[PDB]
Design a binder for this molecule. Structure first.
Ligand SMILES: [Mg+2]
Length: 451
């Protein structure tokens, strides 16, 4: 008996949105220590839907200084008197205990922990909660590993754990290597699995691709595009193609028709959010319909790839965060898709990294368009370098199937336009300019005029 409902609604990882909660009750309580409980908490809404959250509770018989407001869940009487319930993920000892359960591949009631074979976990290292992690809770152990504990939990195979495991077990170096994970069942022993968390190698001294790209795209007086960031873009292309190759080998490839109806439905929806799109919708639809019946090769992919999802360590580019297409249910997130769609996601990301500058300037600051010209030249240079690096590993240039590639870029830009129109109108010119450019790129490719 803790007032879970009163506490959870204030948490940044709580996704109740505006909704009235009917109840918030533990579905399963699993003791880990005499003062540590693992809880699956079911929150029920007025429409009858239930959303499950994972909580770990540290009990204290007296107020413990280290915990702040967000980590204080409530109070209850126990067998030795009054107790305060804290969010145990903010307790270094409790976080270390979870890491030790992973290390041992322990089974505690219906909780199953597993250490990846041959992995070493930093049981000695100081645990610190990462403030950057928003949707889940992450605890970084020294400079060696990160424990990510899922907050909202759902049944089925977790794609981030699944694909990271495939990549690590195959020896692919372009990941933050999976070191362990843990899970439970959805409705007691013998029912659907429910992933609970993961442990990955942590890279100190890394840089986010988006930060490196934007720094390059902002260098003053850089009218002659430089080779240093092109070299990085090439190495990034190598890494993405290497990840795709490992995934294709492990999880297979297959053929499907280009998904004309799906991209048309996205276009129809987007055009409702962004009226600017109506003027382009007929042209977009024509290009998509030219792909009706086109067979495409599909495989397991990253699914939400952009420069925010890649890290440069001193030695390599890594891809992270394989949960898949945002907003989609788990089954959909595990569908195979074209590797060219992941390539398209990086190309869109280059466009934003260069053109963010322009939407933030006053018109008078680029009256003759010379900074816009530089942005275009920078995107072209680094897109070519990325595709070339991809080709060097894949043995096939993504630009070869240029029609399919451009159609995926176009579908992303249509979706971006709807987003910017709703949430950031000043950024709308970025995907609108892309749509007109890509319409020509795609028309050229559909006629086999691309290089
Ligand atoms: Mg991410």
């Amino acid at each position: 008996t803790l007032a879970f409902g009163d506490w959870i609604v204030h948490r940044r990882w709580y996704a109740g949105r505006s909704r009235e909660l009917v109840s918030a009750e533990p579905a399963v309580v699993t003791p880990l220590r005499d003062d540590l409980d693992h809880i699956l908490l079911d929150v029920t809404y007025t429409d009858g839907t239930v959303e499950r959250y994972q909580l770990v509770v540290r009990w204290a018989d007296s107020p413990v200084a280290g915990f702040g407001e967000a980590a204080t869940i409530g109070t209850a009487l126990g067998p030795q008197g009054e107790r305060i319930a804290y969010d145990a993920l903010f307790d270094p000892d409790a976080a270390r205990h979870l890491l030790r359960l992973v290390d041992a591949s322990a089974t505690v009631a219906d909780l199953r922990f597993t250490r990846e074979p041959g992995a070493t976990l930093p049981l000695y290292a100081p645990p610190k909660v990462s403030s950057a992690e928003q949707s889940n809770t992450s605890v970084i152990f020294g400079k060696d590993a990160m424990l990510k504990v899922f907050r909202r939990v759902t049944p089925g195979i977790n794609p981030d754990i699944e694909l990271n495991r495939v990549l690590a077990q195959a020896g692919n170096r372009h990941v933050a290597r999976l070191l362990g994970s843990f899970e439970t069942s959805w409705a007691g022993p013998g029912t659907d699995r429910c992933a609970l968390g993961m442990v990955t190698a942590f890279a100190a001294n890394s840089a986010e691709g988006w930060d490196m790209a934007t720094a390059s795209a902002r260098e003053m007086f850089a009218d002659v595009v430089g080779s240093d960031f092109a070299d990085e873009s090439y190495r990034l292309g190598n890494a993405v193609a290497s990840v795709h190759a490992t995934l294709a080998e492990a999880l297979g490839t297959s053929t499907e028709p280009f998904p004309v109806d799906t991209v048309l439905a996205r276009l129809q929806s987007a055009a409702r959010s962004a009226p600017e799109l109506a003027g382009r919708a007929a042209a977009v639809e024509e290009r998509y319909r030219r792909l009706d019946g086109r067979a495409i090769t599909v495989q397991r992919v990253h699914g939400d790839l952009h420069l925010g999802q890649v890290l440069r360590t001193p030695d390599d580019w890594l891809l992270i965060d394989f949960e898949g297409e945002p907003g989609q249910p788990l089954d959909e997130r595990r569908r195979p898709d074209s590797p060219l769609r992941d390539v398209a996601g990086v190309l869109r990301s280059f466009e934003y990294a260069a053109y963010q500058k322009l939407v933030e300037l006053a018109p008078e600051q680029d009256a003759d368009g010379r900074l816009a010209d530089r942005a275009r030249n920078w995107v072209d240079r680094n897109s070519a370098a990325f595709c070339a690096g991809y080709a060097a590993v894949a043995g096939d240039d993504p630009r070869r199937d240029g029609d399919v590639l451009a159609a995926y870029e176009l579908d992303k830009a249509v979706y971006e336009a709807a987003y910017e129109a709703r949430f950031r109108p000043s950024w709308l010119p970025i995907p609108m300019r892309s749509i007109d450019r890509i319409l020509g790129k795609l028309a050229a490719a559909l006629e086999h005029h691309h290089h």
